[PDB]
A paper describes a structure:
The ferrous iron and 2-oxoglutarate (2OG)-dependent HIF prolyl hydroxylases (PHDs/EGLNs) catalyse trans-4-prolyl hydroxylations on HIFα subunits, thus promoting their binding to the von Hippel–Lindau protein (VHL), a targeting component of a ubiquitin E3 ligase, and signalling for HIFα degradation under normoxic conditions. The PHD-catalysed hydroxylations of HIF-1α/HIF-2α in higher animals occur in amino- and carboxy-terminal oxygen-dependent degradation domains (NODD and CODD).
Analysis of a PHD2.N-oxalyl glycine (NOG).CODD complex structure led us to propose that certain erythrocytosis-associated PHD2 variants (P317R and R371H) would have altered substrate selectivities. Indeed, recombinant P317R PHD2 retains full CODD activity compared with wt PHD2, but strikingly does not hydroxylate NODD, suggesting its phenotype could be associated with loss of NODD hydroxylation. Structures of the P317R, R371H and R396T variants with a clinically used inhibitor628 reveal similar overall folds to wt PHD2, that is, a modified double-stranded-β-helix (DSBH) core (β-strands I–VIII), supporting 2OG and His-X-Asp…His-mediated Fe(II) binding. The structures suggested that these variants probably manifest altered substrate binding, but do not explain how their differing NODD/CODD selectivities arise. The P317R structure reveals Arg317PHD2 present in two conformations, one predicted to interact differently with the LXXLAP motif. The lack of reactivity of P317R PHD2 with NODD supports a relatively more important role for Pro317PHD2 in binding the LXXLAP residues in NODD than CODD. P317R (which does not hydroxylate NODD, 2b) differs in that both inhibitors displace CODD to <10%, which is also less than for wt (with FG4592).
Author numbering: 188 to 404, 408 to 411
The structure:
Amino acid sequence: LPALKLALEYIVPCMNKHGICVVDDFLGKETGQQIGDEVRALHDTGKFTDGQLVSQKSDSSKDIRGDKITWIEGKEPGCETIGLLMSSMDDLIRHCNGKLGSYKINGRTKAMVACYPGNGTGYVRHVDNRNGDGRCVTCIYYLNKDWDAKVSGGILRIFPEGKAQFADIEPKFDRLLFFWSDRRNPHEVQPAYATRYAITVWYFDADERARAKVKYLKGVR
Ligand SMILES: O=C(O)CNC(=O)c1nc(Cl)c2ccccc2c1O
Ligand SMILES: [Mn+2]
């Protein structure tokens, strides 16, 4: 399905109406599986961090750690299908530009690959960009085949501002998610009891990022 058709007929209207947009079967099984293989290779060769310190015990041997991460630019050896994913995300956003609210996206982060190791850890309720750091859209790609939250947990729960309900999103294989990064979409990852992988990039709004430089000071003489 052409990126422009997905953007104009689905991403743009859904984002402007709901601020949370799900696309299933984004790249297809072959490509999705190759991305999965690259992420697992990164994990198995020790490229992830040890995990977020969740419970700090008097005995450090009993510390509980949670989500592990690694930052991926997309050109590294063994990460080229991740890079292809990133380029595909960028193509979509490019075909949306000037139509995602009044934002003008002119950049993004590297990819943050996250692994919840399956030990009952999740991620506390938070806002991605709470203080105007420039990020306007969060984009997440999930890689977990036959994920069933009833058995493995790991639901992403979003609490859209001003609505007495939440939106639960299963981290399903080959699913792509967009949502506004700011305080409109507080969200959490519920405890995961199986290995759970996701790939995140954040897109920058030009004006917000330009003035973020001012309040987050870069020096000349
Ligand atoms: O994985 C998901 O479905 C949702 N994940 C997150 O919202 C999420 N957000 C942030 Cl800001 C971080 C930040 C650091 C590490 C992992 C994160 C994470 O999984
Ligand atoms: Mn988040």
